[PDB]
Amino acid sequence: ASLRDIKTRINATKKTSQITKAMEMVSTSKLNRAEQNAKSFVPYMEKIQEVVANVALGAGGASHPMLVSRPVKKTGYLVITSDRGLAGAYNSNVLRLVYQTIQKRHASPDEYAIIVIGRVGLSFFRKRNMPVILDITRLPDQPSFADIKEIARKTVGLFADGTFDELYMYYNHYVSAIQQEVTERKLLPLTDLAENKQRTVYEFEPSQEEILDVLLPQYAESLIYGALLDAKASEHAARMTAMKNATDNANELIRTLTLSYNRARQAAITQEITEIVAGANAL
Amino acid sequence: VAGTLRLDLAAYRELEAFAQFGSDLDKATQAKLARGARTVEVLKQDLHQPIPVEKQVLIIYALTRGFLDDIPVEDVRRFEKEFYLFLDQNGQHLLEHIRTTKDLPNEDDLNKAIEAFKKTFVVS
Amino acid sequence: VAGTLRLDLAAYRELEAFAQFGSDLDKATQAKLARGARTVEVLKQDLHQPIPVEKQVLIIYALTRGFLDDIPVEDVRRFEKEFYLFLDQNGQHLLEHIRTTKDLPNEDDLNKAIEAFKKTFVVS
Amino acid sequence: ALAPEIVGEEHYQVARKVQQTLQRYKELQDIIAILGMDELSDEDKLVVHRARRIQFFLSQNFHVAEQFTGQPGSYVPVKETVRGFKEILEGKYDHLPEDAFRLVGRIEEVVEKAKAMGV
Amino acid sequence: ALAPEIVGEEHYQVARKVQQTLQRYKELQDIIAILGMDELSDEDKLVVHRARRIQFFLSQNFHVAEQFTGQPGSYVPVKETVRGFKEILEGKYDHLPEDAFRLVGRIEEVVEKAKAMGV
């Protein structure tokens, strides 16, 4: 190729590398800001966790351990995806892990139930032939407890009526900046819980079933909020590592191309020297 | 008409570098990308088909004033081709005015003619 | 005294890449960036004003040992200038000791002299 | 001789569309190498998918090349070439693997090779 | 000739500030396009807000540009332009639309254009 073309390719790759490095920095800042909320939220979750683990068991209620609660009917699922791209294969896989399980298992298109968090979720469910109840167009990177609050209320209330048999979700939890792992865990029918009793009375002016009905939706919402914060931080980590390795690849290509340009130009230099020498000699 | 066209192409050439990231862009940026794509489609031309200067200025005015912002990019060539026949059949007064006075026709009349044509154009 | 400044200036070049975000760690960002910025400030020099080797040694010692830790970046050049004037005023013993032995004077005495200067220097 | 009034409107359009797709695939080669195939948009991925199959289907088995390989070779009429490339462009054969298109004649041989592969 | 003892301290400070603001704006154009300025910090929003006006006010209408556009030219003294740029940097005209700053001479003409456009 010509030196002119090599120069244009090198300049374009520099410009893309600069964009990617800047976006890596922005993602790093957002990750460092989201970690604070992620660590702060824990006390509120743990309070509700211990109280519900103590009081809810032993009685039937709205979100007590339920089995065969209208078994042939929709079941609540959650799809959590990054609002924007540049995160690598993470957005692709978080859809596929939901798909290969629930779409295959559930035969009738109506008897499952999925709602989505994330901008790209509905953008890809344009391709998907899937029923969506309610959705979020965009979530600010701030914790957004108030915004997701009414949506969690919708999830619990439409878990009620028997429409959703179990609330289920798929989201990724980050071990570190390099590791994110997928979750396939059940939430509402309380198939898993641990005993925490040390109380004789704990705000127990109502009955046990009444306090169960009162308290369980907030437990569900707290777990949803924790999952959402974890997923947002996972998105930050994924985009950061994607920008980092993209910058590394771009700089490798730049090294190769610029060195190629430099090996090429010596041939032109020797050609012009040869021409000058021949012109001088022939006279 | 070319005063705005130069600026639009200049902006599109700048944002073409960021266009590689899909639609994950601020709204004004893909608005300008949509304008630039239609500009590029308009400037396209086939072989041995000279165009009168009045028809050139009319189609450039239509592109640059925003009248083409709702036509899909795949239909711009056909839109221009049908627009020339529409201007031949009706609106000969605009062509005659441009041809004689070398200036743009009355703004109201041209807008009404373009709207009347768009009332007859059919999208794919 | 040159080794610590060499290390500080070398360190405050890679971290300048991580400038878009402010506070990663107190050790990584706060201390390193503050000391590097102060090193960059002290190493700046005006036109046609050379300064003697003993005054350079004293100011570099003050920078390295941490007497500039609680001084804002924007005031470092004024601090250095008033420090040279204060040295001319009082520290002729340290100046002559350096100028004769080519060696650092007593560290505790140097510490107390710099503390005495900081007692009077005003940050504004 | 590549003009609409010499080879025909359909032939000219198919040839120009093939060239446009190949040029777009050529331009995408830096972003593919750097940022990876995942981050390309929906249309760019389709362009790559069609372009690789077109590039492979442009290959052919020759009568004189039977000395290097046992494949006997073929003679493909212009109508067959144009119809096959048109069918590839319309997205008819996107469900076949890339390697089915290498070193064959008419478009039906691609289906035959894919069925041998098991499709 | 851009030295403190040649052009004066106020002139030098104003010029250095203008150069610093433009240099900083050069690092945010790329980020703004992908994610709007609302993503950036509050100070950088003002940096962009003022850098656009500085860029537009660096332009001027020439006497010899009559033959190209028809707008008569202007002669701007250095003492006037330094004061204008200092005011723009300190934000006295942050409320005016940026189009008022294009192809203008003295600073008051920007206010006149803003009045004409109906601010």
Side-chain angles (χ1 to χ4, degrees):
Chain A
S2 67
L3 306 180
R4 299 294 296 163
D5 299 341
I6 304 166
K7 286 183 282 289
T8 65
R9 274 201 307 181
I10 287 168
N11 276 127
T13 300
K14 298 288 93 176
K15 205 202 81 63
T16 290
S17 312
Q18 293 157 3
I19 289 162
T20 48
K21 184 59 65 179
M23 293 318 217
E24 197 192 338
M25 294 299 291
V26 177
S27 71
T28 298
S29 176
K30 286 179 176 192
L31 182 147
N32 278 282
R33 174 231 61 91
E35 286 180 349
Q36 311 182 37
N37 274 126
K39 64 178 71 66
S40 177
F41 157 79
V42 168
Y44 284 107
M45 201 295 288
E46 295 281 70
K47 180 198 59 170
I48 308 285
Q49 177 57 252
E50 64 174 0
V51 182
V52 73
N54 190 359
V55 301
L57 323 177
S63 304
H64 85 285
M66 301 165 108
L67 186 59
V68 180
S69 162
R70 178 40 202 280
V72 58
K73 175 63 211 153
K74 318 163 58 192
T75 64
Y77 296 107
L78 298 151
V79 177
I80 293 173
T81 63
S82 85
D83 63 358
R84 299 184 296 110
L86 294 174
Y90 151 85
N91 289 321
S92 74
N93 310 132
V94 298
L95 312 167
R96 300 295 90 190
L97 267 73
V98 181
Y99 201 99
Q100 313 323 339
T101 56
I102 69 168
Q103 192 266 5
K104 170 264 295 181
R105 180 181 65 190
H106 282 341
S108 177
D110 62 358
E111 62 89 19
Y112 61 88
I114 57 183
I115 75 165
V116 188
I117 298 195
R119 201 219 87 73
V120 308
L122 274 296
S123 299
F124 181 77
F125 283 20
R126 303 295 89 195
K127 319 196 212 189
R128 295 302 91 192
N129 46 298
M130 285 306 147
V132 62
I133 296 93
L134 78 170
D135 62 358
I136 298 94
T137 74
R138 214 196 82 69
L139 275 194
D141 215 338
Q142 72 74 20
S144 287
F145 181 76
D147 185 294
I148 193 53
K149 169 162 72 177
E150 61 90 11
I151 297 169
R153 312 210 180 282
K154 263 73 174 175
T155 62
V156 69
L158 193 80
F159 175 77
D161 291 331
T163 62
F164 296 175
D165 273 8
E166 60 262 15
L167 190 144
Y168 204 80
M169 41 195 198
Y170 294 65
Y171 65 97
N172 295 9
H173 57 289
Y174 74 86
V175 176
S176 176
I178 193 66
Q179 296 295 268
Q180 285 167 27
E181 288 70 25
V182 181
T183 64
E184 301 87 4
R185 183 180 63 83
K186 200 175 186 173
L187 193 39
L188 271 43
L190 209 75
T191 51
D192 266 23
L193 183 139
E195 208 65 26
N196 274 270
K197 59 181 289 185
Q198 67 160 358
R199 276 84 167 182
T200 298
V201 66
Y202 199 91
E203 309 187 319
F204 204 74
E205 63 96 17
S207 66
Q208 171 163 9
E209 312 92 330
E210 182 46 39
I211 208 167
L212 192 168
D213 274 8
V214 166
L215 207 54
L216 268 293
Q218 293 82 17
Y219 158 88
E221 174 175 351
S222 299
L223 272 296
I224 291 290
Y225 184 52
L228 168 53
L229 293 179
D230 169 348
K232 283 292 187 185
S234 307
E235 176 188 323
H236 288 161
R239 255 208 292 281
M240 201 205 57
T241 189
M243 295 297 92
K244 186 259 182 183
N245 63 25
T247 49
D248 189 358
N249 285 272
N251 292 330
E252 156 69 13
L253 190 64
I254 280 294
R255 169 267 198 182
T256 52
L257 288 183
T258 313
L259 187 150
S260 312
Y261 181 84
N262 273 294
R263 66 177 64 89
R265 183 180 63 83
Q266 74 91 59
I269 298 314
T270 187
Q271 183 53 224
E272 54 91 11
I273 295 303
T274 303
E275 271 156 30
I276 296 301
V277 164
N281 190 359
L283 290 175
Chain B
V1 301
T4 314
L5 182 73
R6 298 202 74 85
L7 272 300
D8 291 331
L9 264 182
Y12 176 65
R13 284 191 231 91
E14 182 65 26
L15 294 176
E16 189 185 50
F18 312 128
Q20 80 194 23
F21 294 98
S23 64
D24 186 23
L25 295 205
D26 176 18
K27 204 166 64 76
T29 70
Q30 70 264 15
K32 267 152 65 184
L33 297 177
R35 178 56 76 81
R38 287 168 179 75
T39 294
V40 174
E41 278 294 292
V42 164
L43 283 183
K44 215 157 287 185
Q45 185 167 4
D46 63 358
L47 188 73
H48 302 325
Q49 288 274 39
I51 298 170
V53 71
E54 51 270 24
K55 283 178 174 174
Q56 300 185 33
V57 307
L58 288 175
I59 184 59
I60 288 169
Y61 174 94
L63 162 78
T64 191
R65 296 299 193 261
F67 286 98
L68 271 73
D69 279 353
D70 57 359
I71 303 299
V73 183
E74 290 76 28
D75 274 329
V76 169
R77 305 285 298 283
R78 186 165 62 87
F79 183 95
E80 178 182 6
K81 179 186 301 296
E82 295 188 43
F83 189 48
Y84 293 157
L85 303 186
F86 173 82
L87 290 170
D88 278 349
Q89 284 315 101
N90 314 93
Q92 287 277 2
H93 53 290
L94 309 176
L95 300 179
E96 271 145 30
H97 180 279
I98 296 159
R99 193 154 48 228
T100 53
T101 71
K102 303 298 178 62
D103 197 19
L104 283 173
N106 175 35
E107 181 172 343
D108 289 339
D109 296 320
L110 181 48
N111 293 356
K112 293 208 171 265
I114 290 166
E115 290 276 16
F117 171 63
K118 289 186 72 181
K119 213 170 310 293
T120 59
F121 189 72
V122 57
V123 70
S124 311
Chain C
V1 70
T4 306
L5 188 153
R6 165 72 82 170
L7 291 178
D8 267 351
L9 172 53
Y12 181 49
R13 276 313 162 192
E14 315 275 11
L15 281 67
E16 190 97 350
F18 293 61
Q20 304 218 330
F21 178 48
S23 47
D24 191 4
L25 283 72
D26 72 79
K27 175 213 72 53
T29 72
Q30 174 65 42
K32 300 305 191 151
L33 292 179
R35 276 276 288 274
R38 286 161 177 72
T39 291
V40 172
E41 203 69 18
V42 300
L43 291 185
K44 284 175 182 171
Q45 190 155 357
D46 287 334
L47 195 64
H48 304 330
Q49 283 160 101
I51 61 167
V53 63
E54 76 269 351
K55 285 176 177 165
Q56 301 176 34
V57 164
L58 291 177
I59 193 66
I60 297 304
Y61 179 96
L63 171 84
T64 52
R65 301 316 194 254
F67 285 90
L68 277 297
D69 290 353
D70 59 331
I71 297 302
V73 180
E74 67 274 16
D75 288 331
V76 173
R77 304 189 74 192
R78 203 183 71 248
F79 177 86
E80 182 192 338
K81 181 166 63 73
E82 273 159 53
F83 183 57
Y84 294 158
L85 277 296
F86 165 82
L87 290 175
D88 281 345
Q89 188 183 347
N90 295 340
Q92 268 73 18
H93 66 302
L94 302 166
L95 285 195
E96 272 294 317
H97 183 244
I98 293 176
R99 194 145 45 220
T100 53
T101 69
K102 271 68 182 181
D103 198 6
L104 276 174
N106 284 328
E107 294 80 5
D108 59 356
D109 186 12
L110 185 50
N111 292 121
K112 76 186 68 168
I114 302 157
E115 289 171 28
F117 172 60
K118 287 169 64 69
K119 180 65 66 67
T120 71
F121 171 67
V122 62
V123 167
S124 189
Chain D
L2 193 74
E5 82 278 2
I6 305 176
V7 300
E9 275 282 343
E10 182 174 23
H11 186 146
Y12 184 71
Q13 305 311 326
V14 168
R16 292 307 195 190
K17 192 53 64 194
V18 163
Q19 288 187 316
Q20 177 175 328
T21 295
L22 290 175
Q23 174 62 226
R24 183 53 184 174
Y25 182 70
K26 200 179 190 292
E27 288 170 21
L28 290 174
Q29 286 277 78
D30 291 331
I31 190 167
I32 284 164
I34 301 299
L35 183 63
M37 190 79 50
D38 62 358
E39 296 294 334
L40 282 72
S41 74
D42 201 334
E43 183 44 43
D44 292 299
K45 273 140 51 194
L46 196 57
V47 161
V48 166
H49 195 82
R50 306 271 169 75
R52 287 186 55 82
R53 286 163 169 68
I54 286 172
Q55 183 68 272
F56 282 169
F57 187 52
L58 280 165
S59 71
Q60 189 173 346
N61 63 6
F62 278 8
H63 292 284
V64 301
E66 204 181 8
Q67 53 205 330
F68 321 121
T69 176
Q71 207 169 11
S74 65
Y75 175 99
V76 194
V78 190
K79 298 298 293 295
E80 312 299 325
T81 73
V82 173
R83 182 182 60 87
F85 271 102
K86 192 193 178 21
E87 267 153 29
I88 282 181
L89 282 174
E90 307 296 318
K92 185 171 291 183
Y93 295 117
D94 291 353
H95 56 277
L96 302 185
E98 291 177 339
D99 285 332
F101 300 88
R102 313 167 50 103
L103 302 178
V104 294
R106 309 173 184 233
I107 192 64
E108 282 73 36
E109 298 175 43
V110 175
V111 183
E112 288 175 9
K113 188 161 172 170
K115 182 63 69 177
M117 269 187 179
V119 65
Chain E
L2 189 60
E5 73 268 11
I6 297 175
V7 295
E9 178 68 12
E10 177 183 48
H11 187 278
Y12 185 70
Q13 292 295 339
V14 167
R16 183 63 60 234
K17 289 301 301 299
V18 170
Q19 291 200 297
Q20 287 179 0
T21 55
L22 289 169
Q23 169 69 43
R24 181 58 189 156
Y25 177 53
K26 185 66 38 186
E27 298 167 18
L28 307 184
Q29 290 159 11
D30 53 356
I31 296 177
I32 283 164
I34 303 298
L35 280 72
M37 65 182 179
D38 47 319
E39 180 271 301
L40 281 163
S41 178
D42 194 6
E43 293 82 3
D44 294 288
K45 287 166 209 176
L46 279 177
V47 163
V48 180
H49 184 84
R50 291 185 181 141
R52 299 290 308 295
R53 286 156 174 74
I54 285 163
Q55 274 201 5
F56 290 159
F57 195 59
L58 283 167
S59 74
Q60 185 175 342
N61 57 325
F62 281 175
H63 300 79
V64 301
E66 280 274 80
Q67 70 188 284
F68 311 125
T69 300
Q71 186 182 225
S74 66
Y75 183 96
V76 184
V78 60
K79 212 173 190 293
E80 301 297 326
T81 180
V82 298
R83 179 179 65 85
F85 275 97
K86 184 188 68 79
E87 290 172 14
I88 296 169
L89 278 170
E90 78 184 72
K92 186 191 241 203
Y93 302 113
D94 283 340
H95 58 288
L96 297 187
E98 68 186 32
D99 181 41
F101 295 75
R102 292 177 69 114
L103 277 298
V104 172
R106 310 191 182 227
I107 183 61
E108 282 79 30
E109 305 171 41
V110 185
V111 183
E112 168 52 41
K113 272 185 56 164
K115 283 182 56 66
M117 294 182 286
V119 74

